[PDB]
Design a protein around this ligand. Structure first.
Ligand SMILES: O=C(O)CCC(=O)C(=O)O
Ligand SMILES: O=C(O)CCC(=O)C(=O)O
Ligand SMILES: O=C(O)CCC(=O)C(=O)O
Ligand SMILES: O=C(O)CCC(=O)C(=O)O
Ligand SMILES: [Cl-]
Ligand SMILES: [Cl-]
Ligand SMILES: [Cl-]
Ligand SMILES: [Cl-]
Ligand SMILES: [Mg+2]
Ligand SMILES: [Mg+2]
Ligand SMILES: [Mg+2]
Ligand SMILES: [Mg+2]
Ligand code: NA
Ligand code: NA
Ligand code: NA
Ligand code: NA
Lengths: 396, 396, 396, 396
């Protein structure tokens, strides 16, 4: 039969955070996988999955939108956030199982592909080498290190890189992440120190990148509109591919964008057409970042179509492990209005051990694979060789 | 010292669902409690609390808004829903501990009281006796039972009662709850059967209530705007205190209200000024229902003040156990713009065993107690005598 | 008992204006104080307090929100302005009495503190030394004096300074304050003379400040939107922390801000969420200035929470005596979305005599005290040694 | 010369409140008078007048708009409310002095008259006979009394009457005025008791009035939008000339009006074009009530012209003593877009002693007098024979 027989979760060490997975088995013996995350502000996702998965056993693996509709009803009062993350993780495992059942890549469930390769940017560059030097080397500890990381991206034929906010002139080099309580300064004011450091950092990065490579800047939730505006004015004369700003104020974000000489991206934390709508209504973004790992890829197709009707291009949010990358690859393959794809090129020394296939890059683009399902499977034996730690990420 | 030494969660049987509690201990030996819930669409709250509580140990019990601000930063990407429920549960335990530390009732942290007693409505009447007859009697299984429950409310001096949607003429009497997948009909269409049953039910309830007692109707998430409008037209000639409609469409809800001859209430599932704002901007409600158990009472004071500036009165969402009632009582005591308070008068046979003090009612009003903290404590030994079941509620 | 036994007002000389105080005594012997003001356009506040205080005697000191709600009802037709100032003065005295009664600093009634120290700006710098040289020295009478005052701020480790509008090249140095009828030119036109003087002044101030110290500009009510726009264009190339503009035209202010290359602050004269709302709806401000002396600190917490939902940071309005500073300190301690705190560093030669404790500053920040109540008490005997003059301020 | 030599205030007993007056003397010996009020939520007006009058002595009596413009500058931060009431009282005294100086009625300063007589309604009917029976008889203590008062209005050829909210069936007959804390129920909820009493009262009043006499209903600030809507639905089948609702929520009031089968009036407490604007923008009113005693008659001409551009007719707020009536008469004489004029026909036994001329009525209309100034003067000797009491009105 085509019934779901079991829904399990697994977890392994990813250094400063854990990777999580859904493993869904059908009565046919087919296994569908997804990857999900709890460290990005998201304790409880596993608990959600364990409850919702109980309801799924006995149901048809083919009927993923039936499951979504039921799940949404059962959790309607507390929808969004970690509830919706659990639903999306399950959806993505179901899609893998269905694609494998029909012997096709996941993009064949999503309209077929319309491109073979997707341009990417090398994300968290040099962010990972500064913030998590024990896991990603060579460690970056100064402005010259910032420049050399940018030089490395260019030599490796990457077309674009994305950095964050760093303080260079107050002792050791460190991230400025007050939006996430590092440091705890909940007003999120932007002072002169923050501004001249941003400038110094980007000048060094541009130095290393050369004039052709594109530079993206992510400001996450690290200011209020006032401060975002001050940052953009400070950086008026830089050539930025986009400036990324997360906000739960469509009005505020729209105001910032209206006064921005750079393209503005946002929305990576949002769920469903519903949450995206007020941002589009407000003219708040140039580019909509869609987290398909969180939303589920099927729900994300609905969001991409909505953006398309507004002539807004989308970019997948992709900063986890290889299976997340392959999930997003299949989304990217199928979406016409695709801005670019995010990927972390810095890898854990054991990343490849955890998965059956690695993403393949060529001339700054990700090759879309053509194997049944997402294109890679977690390896149970390697997962068990890398036991998880207590929650990390934002909660470290 | 005034440091938090431990944050624990406890759980017990409440029949068709469980009760959950936060137990927070200070270095002084003071214990603050809250009650929270997972059955109302909300798996994962305990997992959230267990992570966030780790960060709280070692911090000052007095600084509850510091904790909130930090927590909000740490979980910013997945805020709302079950994350915000965990934060609110912790907030409410912290408020209890601080009030006990200063030897005052919680309402003294909230501006002082401005009323001694609060009028209530008897909620889920006869809903609990129909849907959970094994726990609340006498069982209601027909229209005459509906009438007699209403007669009982009047004789007991209750001024108002709230019912839901029931089917009387299709075999046994049963709830109509498609919004929550009982039955699974995800379009949420409202047919003729639903309409004439609603009518039959309310006529019987009005019969028993007499002309003075107020009747509230809760439609929860059980239709789309189209269907809510059909329901209201059908019930144009009924005298309803309010019709309660939950919606994630401010535009849609506003439309319904604009065509409603009855006062409309909503918002019980919403978090923070932020989520309430689009509803108020749209003129969507007569009354804002605030879930202070979910939001935390301190955050709910901010929401009540926002409603007050719009000349909107608020009503606490209160359909759990005695500690929830006492938490809401303290909110109700302090808020000027208070519509009425919800309370479930049907009680579990062991409800009183679980808590040190029961809410006291007189002439259809809840008496606001004047003991340190919320006014009641869960009893650990009784909690352990009532071990929990697997998750129930919407997930049963 | 905890009943209020008396509500008195006191007044003393503050040079070019008077200080006023509310003294509230409980049956326990506890005395709560506030400071208020009449010179800033506000004759009648004392008369309001004397009527409203009569109603308060016999009521519980703990129930400050009950008092507010009653007061608001009794004065509803003429709410705002000097009526609301009287209510706010009484509220602040009640908060002091309640905090002292519970043996805690006032910030413990406001959510607990979330910071130990608050960055400040040195306000009316060099405004006080130019306009009131008989009370604050060394007198500033030219551009070199302007520069040296700025140099002094830097040497004293202040991070920011705020100036106003001055005419340098038309005889003696003097303030331009047509908004307040000095001079009487009620059109409030901005001519070339005003523009080049503003420029000359700020260039000198920047000269003295160095490149790190922040410069704020307050334009008060001294133009119409047309003129504010001309001023901002003239000053397009200056690095200003904010430009402060008071306006009773949200539409007009929003227009100015939309065309401003500097952050815009306003709202210091506004009362309640109600009056702030149209400004936030219009996108009129970067920063909301809140007068907690006028509003009352409890009402101001509601306003700060409203601003927070709009991702707007707030700044207390603080330009009176030490008790006002300490009141605002407690507000600043408790509010997450705090931009910065205003303070007048120039002091009267007898300022310290009037109060039991002086505000303490270190490395450009105000230290939040931890004594019961606001942190300082007016001294009755010193108040009587400094008898008041006839009303001054704007009415001088 | 034409200089102002003195500005004085006087006060006398008006039973349950005091009357206040401004007395302005010119160097020519001409005396201009106005009447003002403090009991209607407005402590401090006298204090405002005493400060502002000091600035006026020495200035030209002819230049009333110069005075206003200066005053507005001097009090700009706390404008509105009791400050603006003081300015308006002074304006009205200045207008009297100028009209007397030029030997004309005040309406000749206001565009000339365009009508000789103004239709009125008999206001506070039977409100004054119920609430202040010691001053206005015959006392009304039941529904038959309500009917007979209405019969008396008809026999006396009054075309319209205005009543308020009364409770008939809960012991003695009493006013329902929770908006003004009588009783203190700050939520301002409207229950079934309030609704059926309103109905009983109006039915009795209609009984006595007959079918031709118009009935106005004033609900003041006694509900929230929810409750106003419930009241209007309850009274859907009554023929009401208007329903008067005071609100500081233009959005809320507009909503109520949009669902009202009766004309809605409001605005009696508002100051200047500025405060009226959001109500007109929102479509909130059929009729704008203008308080010219509060605003000043010259400022009120600006407000009437603004209403006229919106095709909104205005009605003066007039519920004080004879001089207030005569001030409003002159306004009413000059304004094209005049709905009707309010007047209290119930008089104090000493009302006529206080003034040189009484308003004259004929066939339900007020005759506009043609004497220099407003048309009546307070009598100093009679004022002193009626010494004031402590503040009454809302503050009683
Ligand atoms: O930078 C982070 O904290 C991770 C998420 C993110 O913002 C991104 O990948 O664009
Ligand atoms: O009826 C339910 O499902 C419970 C929650 C609710 O809607 C209420 O208590 O008002
Ligand atoms: O400058 C003034 O007139 C005093 C009030 C003010 O605007 C401020 O302190 O910011
Ligand atoms: O009824 C009152 O309290 C007096 C003022 C009023 O509303 C009116 O005269 O229309
Ligand atoms: Cl901060
Ligand atoms: Cl369906
Ligand atoms: Cl001018
Ligand atoms: Cl109430
Ligand atoms: Mg990002
Ligand atoms: Mg409900
Ligand atoms: Mg200012
Ligand atoms: Mg009225
Ligand atoms: Na989110
Ligand atoms: Na929700
Ligand atoms: Na103001
Ligand atoms: Na008013």
């Amino acid at each position: 039969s085509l019934k779901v027989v079991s829904v399990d979760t697994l977890c392994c060490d990813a250094g400063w955070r854990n990777y999580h997975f859904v493993k869904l088995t059908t009565d046919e013996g087919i296994v569908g996988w997804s990857e999900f995350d709890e460290g990005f502000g998201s304790p409880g996702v596993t608990a959600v999955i364990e409850q919702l998965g109980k309801r799924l056993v006995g149901a048809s693996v083919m009927e993923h939108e039936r499951f979504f509709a039921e799940a949404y009803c059962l959790t309607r009062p507390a929808t969004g956030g970690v509830v919706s993350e659990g639903i999306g993780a399950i959806e993505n495992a179901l899609l893998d199982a269905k694609a494998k059942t029909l012997n096709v890549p996941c993009y064949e469930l999503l309209g077929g592909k319309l491109r073979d390769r997707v341009p990417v940017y090398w994300s968290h560059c040099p962010t990972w080498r500064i913030n998590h030097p024990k896991f990603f080397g060579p460690p970056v500890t100064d402005l010259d290190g910032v420049k050399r990381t940018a030089e490395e991206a260019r030599e490796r034929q990457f077309r674009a890189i994305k950095t964050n906010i760093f303080i260079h002139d107050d002792g050791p080099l460190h991230a400025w992440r007050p939006g996430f309580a590092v440091p705890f300064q909940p007003a999120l004011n932007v002072d002169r120190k923050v501004l001249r450091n941003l400038r110094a950092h980007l000048e060094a990065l541009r130095d290393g990148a050369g004039p052709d490579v594109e530079i993206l800047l992510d400001l996450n939730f690290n200011a209020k509109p006032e401060g975002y505006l001050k940052i953009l004015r400070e950086l008026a004369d830089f050539d930025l591919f986009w400036v990324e700003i997360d906000s739960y104020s469509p009005q505020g974000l729209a105001y910032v964008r209206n006064h921005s000489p750079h393209p503005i991206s946002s929305c990576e934390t949002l769920f469903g057409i519903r949450e995206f709508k007020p941002f589009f209504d407000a003219n708040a973004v140039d580019v909509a970042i869609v987290d398909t790992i969180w939303n589920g890829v099927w729900q994300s197709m609905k969001i991409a179509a909505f953006a398309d009707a507004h002539d807004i291009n989308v970019a997948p949010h992709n900063f986890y492990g290889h299976l997340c990358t392959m999930i997003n690859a299949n989304f990217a393959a199928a979406v016409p209005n695709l801005r670019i794809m995010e990927t972390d090129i810095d890898r854990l020394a054991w990343e490849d051990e955890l998965f059956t296939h690695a993403p393949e890059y060529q001339n700054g683009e990700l090759i879309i694979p053509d194997r049944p399902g997402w294109g890679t499977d977690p390896v149970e034996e390697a997962i068990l060789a890398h036991p998880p730690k207590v929650m990390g990420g934002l909660l470290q």
